[model samples]
Target chain A: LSRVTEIRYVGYGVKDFDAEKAFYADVWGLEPVGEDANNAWFKAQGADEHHVVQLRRADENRIDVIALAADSRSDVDALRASVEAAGCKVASEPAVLATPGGGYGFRFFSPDGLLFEVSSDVAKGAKRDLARWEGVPVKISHIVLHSPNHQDMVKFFTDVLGFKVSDWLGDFMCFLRCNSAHHRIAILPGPPCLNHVAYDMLSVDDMMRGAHRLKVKGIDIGWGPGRHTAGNNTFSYFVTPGGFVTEYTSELEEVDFDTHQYKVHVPAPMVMDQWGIGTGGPQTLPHPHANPGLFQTAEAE
Target chain B: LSRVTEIRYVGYGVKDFDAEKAFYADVWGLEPVGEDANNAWFKAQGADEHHVVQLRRADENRIDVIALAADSRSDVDALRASVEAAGCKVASEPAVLATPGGGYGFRFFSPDGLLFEVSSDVAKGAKRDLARWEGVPVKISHIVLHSPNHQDMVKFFTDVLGFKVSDWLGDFMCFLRCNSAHHRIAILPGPPCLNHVAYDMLSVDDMMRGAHRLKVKGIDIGWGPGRHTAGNNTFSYFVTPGGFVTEYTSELEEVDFDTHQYKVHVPAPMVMDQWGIGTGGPQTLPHPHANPGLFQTAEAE
Candidate 1:
């Protein structure tokens, strides 16, 4: 199918590096793997790779990049060809990365105008022997992106990028997977922006431990600590210092690749959560306005 | 290595069947699949089987039984022989069960003297075409049992019953799995009693929706709506009408049997929840005393 192997990492443009840094370190329990004046990298507890999250200092909060890992350099080239053939806008030409855990990659814009990168050969970071705390997330689980033209985005991911459809919540939301996980990225109808990013927890207990830790630090949960029907993942979402939502999640279903059977579910309150603890609908919490300076492009350093 | 397939079902002895029945139906949204005067059977939304939970009207609230599913009749016979060889108390001989779903089975007590059943060929209930409500639990997720002698219980489950250790919260709590899920049962230190029973929800949104539904019914959350480290399941605990705690959980980890590596975690406040939203520790909420009527054998029906 020529799909990317997995979601590699996501980059964000944030206003306050210190507050965002503290939020991730103290609340999420991510280890600081690398950082400089312009950007910061944090590794999840059990992951060996250098970073799953990268934050760049900017005037405001915006999703800078969402990266997917290709299985090989050949696969990256194939994807780049597919993207160009589909007439998608190429943001950056394929090249070797100079960033931490250097990799070969390219960036592009989807039909819905979201920035995405495909890469291979990323250097691996040393694995942590022990967690600094119990609830530290192990890796980035998935990310949800808001799109006005949901159908176009879905087609691009499946037809062009080789992602298989996992499930759909009516026509409003679509879950797509490149690997075994039920979904690595979900597209939902809304203003184009970063919906939320989910980090994988070791267990339900670890997710709660992380949630409670955030609560004690005076960071309130914006939504969840609940489950979703489509992917069957446990989720708890909170607002980051940069104003976007971050989630702790677990138990995402793994798809049987041989039988690519997918379900299209009609949107219902219960469909959102079998437990009925969530607000019930397509989205859980209201989307906060992107930071005032979010649209302003950063000056070249 | 051979292992049991999955947790079959759990049976509870409660003082008031009607109250517990209504609680499961109204709060948890479990469907009344089968019922009689002494016992009521409830099934989760997506399950095809007849019952996942059965509540028997009794003078006291206690764990009536924890049942495990075997792959075949041969497996059940093998387990029965092993139980006898271990010198464990066998409550029932291997035979065709007259219970809700007829099955080949036997019952026994563990080292800590808790009742457990192993069965095969259980009749499958007709699958539901649609959910009766949002947040209707799809299946019985797992159960936590209180064991004063945790080690003995753990040994019995592993050495005798063939449950593999998934993880341990120090020496206090031990998570065990028969199949892919992280754990089908957990043994925690306390008086020999039913600690809590968990129902599997579809997603994080489903769990919260169910929790809120209970809240609207004037039922308060005893603990959680948080995630845990050991199993990485999302959980919310509430006191049942019969006094014991019941939990709604989602996203329990699935273990790969070939590489059955497990982790041993030191018990800590943060281990209970990563977000720090829950009361930190092994026990989610305060343990409520068993109802006064519990332990008293009821008059002859």
Candidate 2:
């Protein structure tokens, strides 16, 4: 299994770079650590380990890239070897993402056309004792993507990227493991958008206390204190001024990567909740086609 | 505090009943419990805990309703009183969602144009064994919605719905607590789209097992095994034939209504990660706008 040390970052396409930067800094408490307007590269402050998330101007609100961090330069080299062995097109040799916070990493795309990168020192690692902003904790944890070609991508990740399956929510959703943590990557199927990104906390108490502070500030809570039946981690979701879902979470299940072999399974639709979710009946929304042609056609029939 | 018992069920809207029905049955592992050519309803087999998710064919994929089960019928009555006191329009009086399996629940909508309901029936629940589905264990866990007008809706939920804030991800997202579960509702800011609807599972182990099965089946493992910094839950997300993002998740923090008071703070984006999410640089994809518009602007947005 590919040993992932930490999440590198996820990229998003923004319509207005200045507006988004303002939102992330003034509204979300991420300071701009570095940026290059010509290249649309912008990093944030208060990210303890590294810049948690990256934003770039892309004329829309969607995810453009997902970056994962390997433990060492050797790890990156090993991943490049695996990609080459799989006969997949290699994009570039390992290098740091260009900018003031330049660090080591490499970029590649998944089978279904999503871009992914693995790296280390992508940004100046955040300090362990940095003071945290009110709602701002520190750093990013995970990223979710929607892809139609599920199988081929799964193979590329497991066989090429060396990621392991951690959890499944029926045939539609599957979780992958790369390190001791339960899930570092979560993929979804759709027209392709960045669903939500997360950051980890030391404990549930810290998460709640931070949440409470946000509540006092009159900012709304978007999702949970709810335990999911999937990864068995506690979670809560909140929307940010930048038009993204940011999560605060804890107690995720870890995997024994050395002894465990990853397997594949079809998940049940009702796998997200353990106690309260399927209560009234199965709740569903309308199909995209109902609203003229504003949405993409179903990627898979 | 509203003495809530648990989340009864989540209700949704779909455009094509038959197509959606097929999607839920085939991809999501929901069994066709009840259906009409115009409307179809499916339940997670063996979960037998009363329906967790409800689907209805509507003009669009919007949140038609959401339900929460109170301890007593009087509790439902009290909810009505509180709704009026909070000064929001009530779309309908509390009503029960009927099912062929002989189960029932109540319904309502928050100020943000989202619908909600609550229900329970020990006798009328489905009779299948969840173990039958085994690796595909599923149940609807939670619902997320996008509202351009987030603040007013947030007030309606906290002031009227009696939901408590669990955490905040800056200005646009917040996790709310209802009952013993962490968050039953996730109100997000958006150009307005149904972000995701999740499923519950028995354990993280089951989730991981199911994930592996999906991999073997050649299904996509989009994102997961990663704990979300938002809700504190481990999550795995996948795409479905029905054109929506579905998640398999575990672990969430719980709120003690007795001891907690609502508070708010800015949810800093830095808190959204544990590691590696932002280490790499930014990447961009072809813009969706490059294609002709496929849908129209809905009134809800």
Candidate 3:
């Protein structure tokens, strides 16, 4: 196993910093814990960490890195060695991180050029007021990424990163978990791009309120507020200012690591939503920035 | 224990039929399954039953009766005997019902004077179109009611109606389940009045879209779009034309009757909402037609 315990934070490179910041802060209700000239960090409600979402200014919107937390400095070193031995390219040398909540980590390239970081010793931010209703996210629940080479990427996450397969929705989508949650990451067959990033809301009500807050501010949903058969989580998707997809989700099924069983299902509309109320398949939903090239950087490789 | 299976329907008496009808139709998205001169019935999406909610013309707004389903005609007969034997007042003799989607049922008064009906053999409505997003509810999930004699009502439900205790949020609130849902009914301490009626939403997305649709029509929420710790369901609350609270809810916890353990919690702000986001407790919300005398008919005695 790669020794990663949980998904720590996701870093995004955005073309417009102010718009993205306003959307996350105003629409999604995240509080800015720290900011610099080119980057900003957001903390979710009830989260002890300094930040769960990190946005950096760039020429185009794209995922910079998906950071996974390790148990210790030794675990980070072990994961770095495992990636190199598995023949994946190391993007950065294992060293102490200088990000918002300082940590020790290194970056590596997945099979299809997605960047990932493994780290430990990150600084804890102020504890969130659990009673605050506005703009509060409990934590970063999961992330979905489009993988052109699905099998290669799946293998890299499972064999190299030590994530366990939670479930699969046909040959096109796979869910993987490093912790008890059904999934912390999912891979979908498509051009390499960030499909969606999900934040945990307290209940179905919180998710709706968050969505309603956004709607009043003139931002509408892209897809869902429905339950997925695979993860059994409630979800609502919306397009961010940078054209990336963001989701508010809740009630994800927790798997017992010791006795958990994985399931593979054939893709169907009913399978997508047991209640049969979603408007269409995931692909039919609106995505203003559907093109992968819009988020790709010259150094993605 | 009585043989009640699930909550069948909740009847509300309202003075302004047009405003209530518009709110339910335009904001909540329930289909007008059947209507007549004095009454109208609404059916939720995916529900085969003819109606989950019925609005009757009355002088003021108040709950008429909360109907419970029986397994069969025999079960209804058995319950009638049980209620009579328990020394409860039988408002109506056990017989065939004359109402929308006629069924066998009898009306009775609970200890606290709330009306109830036990029925079976109700006619089923046609399956709803699930693809539609506007004002669609999957089914009626649960109802909350204020009880002056909380213990008396709880005893009547558990001892006379075969309800199982799901959980308690202190001595004032009691959650009761008929099937697997965490709660099909809950009792809150106060003067006898309808607290809220929840509709099962297809997902978090459906709930938000419904809320947005209502917001667009100038029907803002009364409270919520937050999760409740008791039932673990996502929820959003709004005050209707008659002053009763209506909610859109999803992802309630399913309990195994044989294996489920009851939970009791101290009433607190955090206990009511695991996320600490609701603007105020249920008591602080608006209830324009809160006087029970407004909803009571001479026949209620």
> What TM-score between 0 and 1 does chain B of candidate 3 receive?
0.92
Error of 2 at A23 (Å): 38
Q: After superposition, how far is residue A106 of candidate 3 from its true place, in Å?
A: 1.0
For B139-204, candidate 2 gives per-residue lDDT tens digits of 556666666676666666677667777766667776666655667667777644456766776555
Chain A TM-scores of each predicted structure, in the order given, are 0.91, 0.75, 0.91
TM-score-sorted candidate list, best first: 1, 3, 2
Cα-lDDT of candidate 3? 0.77
Q: Tens digits of per-residue lDDT for model 1 on A1-301?
A: 4667788788888888789988887777888888797889998877876688898988766777788999888889889999999998887788998778999988887765567889998998877554433888888888888777788888988888888888999888999888888988898877777788899888766676677678778877676656778988877888887777889898888888556688999988657665545332335465634323322223321
- Looking at model 2 chain B, report the run of 10 residues with the lowest lDDT sum: B285-294
Q: List candidate 2 segments past 4 Å from native.
A: A1-301, B1-4, B45-47, B57-59, B94-106, B119-133, B191-193, B211-225, B254-257, B260-270, B273-301
- Encode model 2's per-residue lDDT on A25-78: one tens digit a residue: 655556555577533333433455456667766545555566777877888878
